[PDB]
Design an enzyme around this catalytic site. Structure first.
Site, PDB file in Angstrom:
ATOM      1  N   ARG A 104     -18.685  -2.059  -4.545  1.00 48.81           N
ATOM      2  CA  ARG A 104     -18.967  -2.440  -5.932  1.00 48.81           C
ATOM      3  C   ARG A 104     -20.403  -2.949  -6.012  1.00 48.81           C
ATOM      4  O   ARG A 104     -20.647  -4.132  -6.251  1.00 48.81           O
ATOM      5  CB  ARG A 104     -17.990  -3.533  -6.378  1.00 48.81           C
ATOM      6  CG  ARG A 104     -16.525  -3.094  -6.337  1.00 48.81           C
ATOM      7  CD  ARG A 104     -15.589  -4.279  -6.541  1.00 48.81           C
ATOM      8  NE  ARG A 104     -15.719  -5.256  -5.464  1.00 48.81           N
ATOM      9  CZ  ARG A 104     -15.210  -5.115  -4.242  1.00 48.81           C
ATOM     10  NH1 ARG A 104     -14.519  -4.029  -3.916  1.00 48.81           N
ATOM     11  NH2 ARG A 104     -15.399  -6.068  -3.340  1.00 48.81           N
TER      12      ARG A 104
ATOM     13  N   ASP B 157     -12.860  -5.809   2.745  1.00 52.95           N
ATOM     14  CA  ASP B 157     -12.854  -5.700   1.284  1.00 52.95           C
ATOM     15  C   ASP B 157     -11.496  -5.347   0.643  1.00 52.95           C
ATOM     16  O   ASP B 157     -11.120  -5.884  -0.403  1.00 52.95           O
ATOM     17  CB  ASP B 157     -13.945  -4.677   0.917  1.00 52.95           C
ATOM     18  CG  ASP B 157     -14.073  -4.425  -0.574  1.00 52.95           C
ATOM     19  OD1 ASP B 157     -13.444  -3.481  -1.082  1.00 52.95           O
ATOM     20  OD2 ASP B 157     -14.822  -5.163  -1.246  1.00 52.95           O
ATOM     21  N   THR B 158     -10.757  -4.457   1.287  1.00 49.21           N
ATOM     22  CA  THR B 158      -9.475  -3.997   0.787  1.00 49.21           C
ATOM     23  C   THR B 158      -8.366  -5.014   0.515  1.00 49.21           C
ATOM     24  O   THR B 158      -8.037  -5.268  -0.649  1.00 49.21           O
ATOM     25  CB  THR B 158      -8.911  -2.941   1.718  1.00 49.21           C
ATOM     26  OG1 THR B 158      -8.830  -3.486   3.044  1.00 49.21           O
ATOM     27  CG2 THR B 158      -9.805  -1.688   1.700  1.00 49.21           C
TER      28      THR B 158
ATOM     29  N   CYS C 184      -4.744   5.653   6.019  1.00 51.45           N
ATOM     30  CA  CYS C 184      -5.226   4.340   6.406  1.00 51.45           C
ATOM     31  C   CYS C 184      -4.672   3.784   7.722  1.00 51.45           C
ATOM     32  O   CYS C 184      -3.473   3.524   7.846  1.00 51.45           O
ATOM     33  CB  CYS C 184      -4.959   3.357   5.275  1.00 51.45           C
ATOM     34  SG  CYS C 184      -5.436   1.689   5.677  1.00 51.45           S
ATOM     35  N   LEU C 185      -5.565   3.588   8.693  1.00 47.51           N
ATOM     36  CA  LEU C 185      -5.186   3.060  10.001  1.00 47.51           C
ATOM     37  C   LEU C 185      -4.817   1.582   9.922  1.00 47.51           C
ATOM     38  O   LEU C 185      -4.134   1.058  10.802  1.00 47.51           O
ATOM     39  CB  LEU C 185      -6.333   3.230  10.997  1.00 47.51           C
ATOM     40  CG  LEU C 185      -6.758   4.650  11.366  1.00 47.51           C
ATOM     41  CD1 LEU C 185      -8.044   4.619  12.152  1.00 47.51           C
ATOM     42  CD2 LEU C 185      -5.663   5.319  12.168  1.00 47.51           C
ATOM     43  N   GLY C 186      -5.260   0.914   8.863  1.00 42.91           N
ATOM     44  CA  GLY C 186      -4.975  -0.505   8.739  1.00 42.91           C
ATOM     45  C   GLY C 186      -3.806  -0.833   7.844  1.00 42.91           C
ATOM     46  O   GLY C 186      -3.536  -1.998   7.578  1.00 42.91           O
TER      47      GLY C 186
HETATM   48  C1  HEM Z   1      -4.530  -3.069   0.885  1.00 39.54           C
HETATM   49  C2  HEM Z   1      -5.214  -2.669   1.937  1.00 39.54           C
HETATM   50  C3  HEM Z   1      -5.823  -1.234   2.146  1.00 39.54           C
HETATM   51  C4  HEM Z   1      -5.818  -0.143   1.400  1.00 39.54           C
HETATM   52  C5  HEM Z   1      -5.191   0.137   0.006  1.00 39.54           C
HETATM   53  C6  HEM Z   1      -6.548   0.900   2.147  1.00 39.54           C
HETATM   54  C7  HEM Z   1      -6.767   2.186   1.697  1.00 39.54           C
HETATM   55  C8  HEM Z   1      -7.378   3.160   2.485  1.00 39.54           C
HETATM   56  C9  HEM Z   1      -7.623   4.526   1.995  1.00 39.54           C
HETATM   57  C10 HEM Z   1      -7.240   4.986   0.578  1.00 39.54           C
HETATM   58  C11 HEM Z   1      -8.178   5.208   3.006  1.00 39.54           C
HETATM   59  C12 HEM Z   1      -8.590   6.729   2.974  1.00 39.54           C
HETATM   60  C13 HEM Z   1     -10.044   7.098   2.726  1.00 39.54           C
HETATM   61  C14 HEM Z   1     -10.233   8.671   2.716  1.00 39.54           C
HETATM   62  O1  HEM Z   1      -9.273   9.415   2.871  1.00 39.54           O
HETATM   63  O2  HEM Z   1     -11.438   8.886   2.522  1.00 39.54           O
HETATM   64  C15 HEM Z   1      -8.331   4.325   4.131  1.00 39.54           C
HETATM   65  C16 HEM Z   1      -8.869   4.654   5.373  1.00 39.54           C
HETATM   66  C17 HEM Z   1      -9.064   3.744   6.393  1.00 39.54           C
HETATM   67  N1  HEM Z   1      -8.764   2.398   6.402  1.00 39.54           N
HETATM   68 FE1  HEM Z   1      -7.539   1.450   5.004  1.00 39.54          FE
HETATM   69  N2  HEM Z   1      -7.022   0.401   3.324  1.00 39.54           N
HETATM   70  C18 HEM Z   1      -6.561  -0.933   3.382  1.00 39.54           C
HETATM   71  C19 HEM Z   1      -6.776  -1.823   4.412  1.00 39.54           C
HETATM   72  C20 HEM Z   1      -7.422  -1.554   5.605  1.00 39.54           C
HETATM   73  C21 HEM Z   1      -7.679  -2.520   6.657  1.00 39.54           C
HETATM   74  C22 HEM Z   1      -7.260  -4.035   6.616  1.00 39.54           C
HETATM   75  C23 HEM Z   1      -8.322  -1.863   7.640  1.00 39.54           C
HETATM   76  C24 HEM Z   1      -8.853  -2.386   9.047  1.00 39.54           C
HETATM   77  C25 HEM Z   1      -7.955  -2.883   9.870  1.00 39.54           C
HETATM   78  C26 HEM Z   1      -8.470  -0.467   7.205  1.00 39.54           C
HETATM   79  C27 HEM Z   1      -9.043   0.535   7.987  1.00 39.54           C
HETATM   80  C28 HEM Z   1      -9.145   1.847   7.588  1.00 39.54           C
HETATM   81  C29 HEM Z   1      -9.728   2.921   8.413  1.00 39.54           C
HETATM   82  C30 HEM Z   1     -10.293   2.708   9.845  1.00 39.54           C
HETATM   83  C31 HEM Z   1      -9.672   4.043   7.683  1.00 39.54           C
HETATM   84  C32 HEM Z   1     -10.163   5.477   8.072  1.00 39.54           C
HETATM   85  C33 HEM Z   1      -9.152   6.447   8.569  1.00 39.54           C
HETATM   86  C34 HEM Z   1      -9.743   7.891   8.902  1.00 39.54           C
HETATM   87  O3  HEM Z   1     -10.800   8.148   8.320  1.00 39.54           O
HETATM   88  O4  HEM Z   1      -9.014   8.492   9.646  1.00 39.54           O
HETATM   89  N3  HEM Z   1      -7.910  -0.298   5.979  1.00 39.54           N
HETATM   90  N4  HEM Z   1      -7.820   3.074   3.821  1.00 39.54           N
END
Ligand code: HEM
Ligand SMILES: [K+]
Length: 405
Positions: free
Chosen positions: A177, A242-243, A348-350
């Site tokens: 943002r 941020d998420t 999402c890995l997280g």
């Molecule tokens: C409410 C919490 C969260 C939501 C809604 C969320 C949502 C997402 C989304 C929509 C993507 C896909 C992006 C794409 O396809 O371009 C993503 C990817 C990812 N997120 Fe989450 N995220 C959250 C929390 C987290 C947290 C806490 C972490 C770290 C521990 C994290 C680590 C990642 C990573 C490493 C990816 C990349 C996966 C790849 O490219 O294979 N996320 N996330």
């Protein structure tokens, strides 16, 4: 303001949606984005804002595009275009098959197993944090909980000192943002500047934190470079700084204005996981996209090689063609359909760490502060972007109605 309409884009599919400042933002972010699913809006539109790009407005188009990585590459997943070109985090910016070897390594540092270890520390911080707020009868949810709770957990998993939080939080915020103080490229460079010395130090004296694991890890057999590790840590930072923070605010804001929903989780706490999932649907907040790797006709629309297409993970679950009464929150909803954690090979890995953090919060908070409202007269402001969020959430409550544990 509006970028000239490319010759190949049909005049009748133009819908100038601004993902960083949506017209109905005052009604709430999700409500603002949902205007894309109004009666006369097509399945796929073109907005001339932010350089111009396509936008899939319905669930099956969004899901289908995420599954077809050959046409919709993650190479340039960010909007505007120059931000998507600078975007080089791993594995977020890679398409199968090369993506896999890196995704596996990342999954090893923030995956389920890791989450199970972290659980007791997650609950302590949650309770520790909540009990301290309990007697005050008030708080600024965003800075008093939403941020420190998930961020400290991440900094712990990453093995980074909490004093770096102000700087890191600022950088990731400018990526999702942007307030204008700095471009995505500038914020990335600064983030990489922060990581470089840390990655080389951790690589000399290997620790047990997520960063040490990544920096010293292997990708399908061969040693990861110092640069590959930097691009991977960037993704992890962006992902967990941020998420969850912003999502917790959307949930608590809704809970503060919904006592009937609160008492439901109070009387029947076993439904909390279900509430978590329904909340993730109703208050989804992520929206990024893909780049066309070649000319390609998608749903009767001619897409040109190089065209960017925003695939709002957020819109799927708000789609009435996926969930009836999408804007209504129902913890008992039979099938909560959504793509809040994404769809396809970049799931999402997280997500597991996220769910755990959300569920622990719901429990521990309602257990100590079952009754609370939004500060009287407070006009809650949402912010839109790759990841939408809440500016501030003042909450008040009578301490007499609370209970210590
Ligand atoms: C409410 C919490 C969260 C939501 C809604 C969320 C949502 C997402 C989304 C929509 C993507 C896909 C992006 C794409 O396809 O371009 C993503 C990817 C990812 N997120 Fe989450 N995220 C959250 C929390 C987290 C947290 C806490 C972490 C770290 C521990 C994290 C680590 C990642 C990573 C490493 C990816 C990349 C996966 C790849 O490219 O294979 N996320 N996330
Ligand atoms: K790129």
């Amino acid at each position: 303001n509006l970028a000239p309409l490319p010759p190949h884009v049909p005049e009748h599919l133009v819908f100038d949606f601004d993902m960083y400042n949506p017209s109905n933002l005052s009604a709430g972010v999700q409500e603002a984005w949902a205007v894309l699913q109004e009666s006369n809006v097509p399945d796929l539109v073109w907005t001339r804002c932010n350089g111009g790009h396509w936008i899939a407005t319905r669930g099956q188009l969004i899901r289908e595009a995420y599954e077809d990585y050959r046409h919709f590459s993650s190479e340039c997943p960010w909007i505007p275009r120059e931000a998507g070109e600078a975007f080089d985090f791993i594995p977020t910016s890679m398409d199968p098959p090369e993506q896999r070897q890196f995704r596996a390594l990342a999954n090893q540092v923030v995956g389920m197993p890791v989450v199970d270890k972290l659980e007791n520390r997650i609950q302590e911080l949650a309770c520790s944090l909540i009990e301290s707020l309990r007697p005050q009868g008030q708080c600024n949810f965003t800075e008093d909980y939403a941020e420190p709770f998930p961020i400290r957990i991440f900094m712990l998993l990453a093995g980074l000192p909490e004093e770096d939080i102000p700087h890191l939080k600022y950088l990731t915020d400018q990526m999702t943002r942007p307030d204008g103080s700095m471009t995505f490229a500038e914020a990335k460079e600064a983030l990489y500047d922060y990581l470089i010395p840390i990655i080389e130090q951790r690589r000399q004296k290997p620790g047990t934190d997520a960063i040490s694991i990544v920096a010293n890890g292997q990708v399908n057999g061969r040693p990861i470079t110092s640069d590959e590790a930097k691009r991977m840590c960037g993704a992890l930072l962006l992902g967990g700084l941020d998420t969850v923070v912003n999502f917790l605010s959307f949930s608590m804001e809704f809970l503060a204005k919904s006592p009937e929903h609160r008492q439901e989780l109070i009387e029947r706490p076993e439904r909390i996981p279900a509430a978590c999932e329904e909340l993730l649907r109703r208050f989804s907040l992520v929206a990024d996209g893909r780049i066309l790797t070649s000319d390609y006709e998608f749903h009767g629309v001619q897409l040109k090689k190089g065209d960017q297409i925003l695939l709002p993970q957020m819109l799927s679950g708000l789609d009435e063609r996926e969930n009836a009464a999408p804007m209504h929150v129902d913890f008992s909803r039979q099938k909560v359909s959504h793509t809040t954690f994404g769809h396809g090979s970049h799931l999402c890995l997280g997500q597991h760490l996220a769910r755990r953090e959300i569920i622990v919060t719901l429990k521990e908070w309602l257990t100590r502060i079952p009754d609370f409202s939004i500060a009287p007269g407070a006009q809650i402001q949402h912010k839109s972007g790759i990841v939408s969020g809440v500016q501030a959430l003042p909450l008040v409550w009578d301490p007499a109605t609370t209970k210590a544990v």
